[PDB]
Amino acid sequence: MQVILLDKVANLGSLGDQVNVKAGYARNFLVPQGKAVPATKKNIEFFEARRAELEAKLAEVLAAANARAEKINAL
RNA sequence: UGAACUCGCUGUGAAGAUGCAGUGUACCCGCGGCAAGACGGAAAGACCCCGUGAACCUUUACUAUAGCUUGACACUGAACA
Ligand SMILES: [Mg+2]
Ligand SMILES: [Mg+2]
Ligand SMILES: [Mg+2]
């Protein structure tokens, strides 16, 4: 079963990672206890949309934080 | 219970005759008795064989199968050596 991890999970991956796993592990533990979700394409697009929007916020925050770093040495 | 005007003998004859041939005997009709015969009555022989019949029963007959048992996969996962 392909699933996308929610919280970080030992031996698998961190939040957002995509991993294959045995159905029974996903069905009876990881999903009920809120640790992962199926790898539905809407979902993986959801997270690709997430990874990229998060990437933009990290690129632009770095564009804002650099700007203030040029201004610190400016004074 | 085919119809009877329904005797003996010896012989003949699907080969054990009231009914055929030959012959003997016998006037017509009951009643009480007897069971030698009518291969008497009753039951499409149960023995025996036959039918490429039936059934039930047995088994190391054949073919299947419930059940019991084997392993693979599924429900069925994690960590650690
Ligand atoms: Mg007669
Ligand atoms: Mg008789
Ligand atoms: Mg008969």
Curated annotation (Swiss-Prot):
The keyword Ribonucleoprotein applies. The keyword Ribosomal protein applies. It comes from the Bacteria. One of its GO terms (molecular function) is structural constituent of ribosome. The modification N6-succinyllysine is found at residue 71. One of its GO terms (cellular component) is cytosol. GO terms for biological process: cytoplasmic translation. Keywords: Acetylation, Ribonucleoprotein, Ribosomal protein, RNA-binding, rRNA-binding. Belongs to the bacterial ribosomal protein bL9 family. Part of the 50S ribosomal subunit. In stalled/collided disomes (pairs of ribosomes where the leading ribosome is stalled and a second ribosome has collided with it) bL9 in the collided ribosome contacts bS6 and uL2, while it contacts only helices of the 16S rRNA in the stalled ribosome; the inter-ribosome bridge thus formed is different from that formed between normally translating ribosomes. One of the primary rRNA binding proteins, it binds very close to the 3' end of the 23S rRNA. This is Large ribosomal subunit protein bL9. The gene is rplI.
